[PDB]
Design an enzyme around this catalytic site. Structure first.
Site, PDB file in Angstrom:
ATOM      1  N   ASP A 297      -9.048  -2.746  -6.057  1.00 47.58           N
ATOM      2  CA  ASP A 297      -8.905  -3.847  -5.112  1.00 47.58           C
ATOM      3  C   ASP A 297      -9.696  -3.621  -3.830  1.00 47.58           C
ATOM      4  O   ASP A 297      -9.553  -4.399  -2.879  1.00 47.58           O
ATOM      5  CB  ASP A 297      -7.425  -4.099  -4.775  1.00 47.58           C
ATOM      6  CG  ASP A 297      -6.762  -2.936  -4.012  1.00 47.58           C
ATOM      7  OD1 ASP A 297      -7.439  -1.933  -3.692  1.00 47.58           O
ATOM      8  OD2 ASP A 297      -5.555  -3.058  -3.687  1.00 47.58           O
TER       9      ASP A 297
ATOM     10  N   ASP B  19      -8.018  -8.723  -2.861  1.00 47.46           N
ATOM     11  CA  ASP B  19      -8.365  -7.391  -2.396  1.00 47.46           C
ATOM     12  C   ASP B  19      -7.151  -6.778  -1.678  1.00 47.46           C
ATOM     13  O   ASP B  19      -6.107  -7.413  -1.514  1.00 47.46           O
ATOM     14  CB  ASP B  19      -9.633  -7.408  -1.531  1.00 47.46           C
ATOM     15  CG  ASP B  19      -9.449  -8.091  -0.190  1.00 47.46           C
ATOM     16  OD1 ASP B  19      -8.474  -7.786   0.518  1.00 47.46           O
ATOM     17  OD2 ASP B  19     -10.338  -8.854   0.226  1.00 47.46           O
ATOM     18  N   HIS B  20      -7.302  -5.524  -1.235  1.00 48.55           N
ATOM     19  CA  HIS B  20      -6.169  -4.762  -0.704  1.00 48.55           C
ATOM     20  C   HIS B  20      -5.523  -5.465   0.488  1.00 48.55           C
ATOM     21  O   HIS B  20      -4.287  -5.551   0.572  1.00 48.55           O
ATOM     22  CB  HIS B  20      -6.627  -3.349  -0.328  1.00 48.55           C
ATOM     23  CG  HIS B  20      -5.513  -2.379  -0.080  1.00 48.55           C
ATOM     24  ND1 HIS B  20      -4.760  -1.827  -1.097  1.00 48.55           N
ATOM     25  CD2 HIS B  20      -5.074  -1.805   1.065  1.00 48.55           C
ATOM     26  CE1 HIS B  20      -3.884  -0.979  -0.583  1.00 48.55           C
ATOM     27  NE2 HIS B  20      -4.053  -0.947   0.727  1.00 48.55           N
TER      28      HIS B  20
ATOM     29  N   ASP C 196      -5.828  -8.754   1.231  1.00 51.43           N
ATOM     30  CA  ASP C 196      -5.405 -10.126   0.952  1.00 51.43           C
ATOM     31  C   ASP C 196      -3.889 -10.222   0.867  1.00 51.43           C
ATOM     32  O   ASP C 196      -3.308 -11.273   1.164  1.00 51.43           O
ATOM     33  CB  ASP C 196      -5.995 -10.625  -0.368  1.00 51.43           C
ATOM     34  CG  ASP C 196      -7.502 -10.831  -0.321  1.00 51.43           C
ATOM     35  OD1 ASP C 196      -8.053 -11.094   0.768  1.00 51.43           O
ATOM     36  OD2 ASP C 196      -8.131 -10.713  -1.400  1.00 51.43           O
TER      37      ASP C 196
ATOM     38  N   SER D 251       0.855  -1.193   0.000  1.00 49.77           N
ATOM     39  CA  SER D 251       0.000   0.000   0.000  1.00 49.77           C
ATOM     40  C   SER D 251       0.885   1.236   0.000  1.00 49.77           C
ATOM     41  O   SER D 251       1.826   1.305  -0.822  1.00 49.77           O
ATOM     42  CB  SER D 251      -0.969  -0.093   1.183  1.00 49.77           C
ATOM     43  OG  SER D 251      -1.845   1.024   1.198  1.00 49.77           O
TER      44      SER D 251
HETATM   45 ZN   LIG Z   1     -10.767 -10.637   1.448  1.00 48.42          ZN
END
Ligand SMILES: [Zn+2]
Ligand SMILES: [Zn+2]
Ligand SMILES: [Zn+2]
Ligand SMILES: [Zn+2]
Ligand SMILES: [Zn+2]
Ligand SMILES: [Zn+2]
Lengths: 382, 383
Positions: free
Chosen positions: B311, B349-350, B352, B109
């Site tokens: 995401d 996703d972000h 994960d 991130s």
């Molecule tokens: Zn998830």
């Protein structure tokens, strides 16, 4: 006035005591029902399925009050594909009848559930009667035969009578997961030790012995019931709620009271509605999408009157069911119509039940608001 | 097996350090990515920087966390942005770090931005801080700002908003962090009142007071005006702020860059917008819906339809590479001095990428499989 006990009906996500030590749906860290009973208003908290259909919840709520074994209807159970019989209750008000009436007070979906209950009490269910005629072998429960005038009044608090434009976005599986996070957090309880009960026994979704909470919940949240008709998600949409309004009648001999909140403000440029600062963070973004969401098609049409909201219920949805008799409160409570009290500015969806982080504009405490609500239904003439 | 340089993991927005949540680690959640990497032949360090501070602040703190010393945000920078010049003092987790003892920076991130910012400061230093030092030699200047340091062999970004997030563009990051702390405490099975979460905003005079409740402290943090400032994570996370950072955070030709992008959004047949997939963490469901339907004509930068896939919090076109910088999609050979963009990982996703609670890792049985391949991948880079 009258001496009828009050019965409180939680809405979506609602839980019974014994599910969280020290954290009640009605009051959060406070006991509202205890405050009402101590101040002379006999009050009962009823507990029905947190996420099932209003139909499922109304039937459960009947047996919770009256006593007996939950029967969802053979025809209903066949059409929607779940078990016919649910839990068995001793009843918190067995003498409940035409003379021993009760007041239904329902927050959020509990307002829909209460109206559903009155409908089933008053008119029974034609569908189940016909199924009985074609199959006398199945039987029928007294709740479905009709003709019971046992509910003096129904009072809805931030109830989506016309549905929620959030529910329309089909993210309620996601919302309820988030809710369960926020709820365990506010109760100061560990996710791993949660005994929160989704009450989806009829769909064969009971917690298995020794099953972890997270594995059980995942079994519930991936269930295909969430894409059906026999589920809260369906009933909460604007189409689904409009569909329910077509046959959950508003009866001429019943007192209906609605309370609506607003926690959104118009943006001067976009004309969209934004949540105020006192709003719980669980609803901040939901309120933002609802504050900016209009829909020409498919039906029903969502125009700009839908933008104001309390976090999860649009104001125009909580005042009365469309098509039903209604009067804005003018000092006199009319029987057989929806008595729509003025929008309560500053009140978010959870402020009505004093969820943690509580704000009660116009009052010192959530107790002072329930004092006036209880005195109000107490005042209704026999 | 090209090099022996250790891995240094750099958390992103809201990231916490070990010693703040026992049993629950930023890198792995209920798993320990770092421990797994160290046990499987890949020396790995976990760095901790300010969860919500600016990339500048965070990069400076990152330098001293690795090298050792006392954090110096720079006299000019502290003058223009209005916070204290000197922060915390660290012993150093890799003191021998230098041109021969290089490191791999892997940032998730915002951590990817912070990693780029640190390479910039190492390589080029700061012209502002040098001019300030020339005009006021009494104040001094830290070695970080003099430049000339080729101490980073590679930078790997995971789900990094190199060009910003259109979520950040709606000025709701305060609300998002308040929600994030709820989820984090819950994931960690910890009561809100007993949290010792550190926002690491000392430089702004926002330390937790003696005997102050966590709620009172966190409220002081979230009501602070720093959130509307020029030197906060909220600002750097906008599309304007990140693309602005890209003008001077250079992609150096002797550095290896690798980026990983996730997608957990799907095109709607009717509207043509993008909606979250069912496996997305609910913390991101609404952010995803907003980003999947958000375009912006003005003010600049222009946000067109390519920004819709995301995401949960980062747009796919933001995560591949910074705009204007050298970049090539991974084709089986890793090029030095360009952004090696690996194919979008569908279903990720972000969160994960770090195995936050409730995560799924498509293509792998656990997050350990993915980091196995990521680690052996920087391990394979030639000296
Ligand atoms: Zn998830
Ligand atoms: Zn049913
Ligand atoms: Zn949340
Ligand atoms: Zn509130
Ligand atoms: Zn700074
Ligand atoms: Zn600056």
């Amino acid at each position: 006035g009258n001496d009828y006990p009050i019965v409180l009906v939680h809405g979506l996500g609602g839980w019974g005591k014994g599910e969280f030590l020290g954290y009640r749906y009605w009051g959060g860290l406070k006991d509202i029902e205890f405050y009402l009973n101590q101040t002379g208003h006999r009050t009962y908290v009823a507990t029905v399925g947190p996420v099932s259909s209003n139909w499922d919840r109304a039937v459960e709520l009947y047996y919770y009050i009256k006593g007996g074994t939950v029967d969802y209807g053979a025809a209903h159970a066949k059409e929607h594909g779940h078990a016919r019989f649910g839990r068995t209750y001793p009843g918190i008000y067995g003498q409940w009848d035409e003379t021993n009436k009760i007041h239904l007070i329902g927050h959020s979906m509990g307002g829909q559930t209460s109206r559903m209950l009155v409908e089933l009490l008053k008119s029974g269910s034609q569908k189940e009667q016909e199924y009985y005629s074609q199959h006398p072998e199945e039987g029928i429960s007294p709740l479905f035969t009709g003709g019971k005038n046992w509910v003096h009044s129904v009072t809805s608090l931030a109830t989506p009578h016309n549905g929620s434009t959030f529910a329309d976005q089909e993210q309620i599986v996601s919302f309820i997961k988030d809710f369960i996070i926020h709820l365990a957090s506010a109760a100061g309880q560990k996710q791993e030790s949660l005994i929160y009960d989704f009450k989806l026994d009829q769909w064969g979704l009971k917690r298995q012995p020794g099953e972890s909470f997270h594995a059980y919940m995942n079994r519930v949240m991936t269930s295909p019931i969430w894409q059906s008709n026999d589920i809260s998600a369906y009933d909460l949409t604007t189409f689904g709620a409009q569909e329910l309004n077509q046959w959950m009648k508003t009866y001429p001999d019943v007192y209906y009271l609605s309370y609506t909140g607003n926690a959104s403000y118009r943006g001067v440029v976009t004309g969209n509605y934004y949540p105020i600062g006192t709003m719980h963070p669980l609803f901040t973004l939901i309120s933002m999408q609802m504050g900016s969401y209009t829909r020409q098609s498919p039906a029903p049409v969502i125009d700009r009157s839908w933008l104001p909201n309390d976090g999860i219920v649009n104001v125009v949805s909580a005042k009365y069911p469309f098509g039903h008799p209604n009067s804005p409160y003018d000092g006199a409570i009319k029987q057989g119509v929806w008595n729509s009290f003025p929008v309560m500015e500053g009140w978010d969806h959870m402020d009505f039940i004093n969820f943690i982080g509580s704000n009660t504009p116009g009052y010192f405490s959530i107790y002072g608001y329930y004092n006036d609500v209880a005195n109000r239904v107490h005042s209704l003439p026999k």
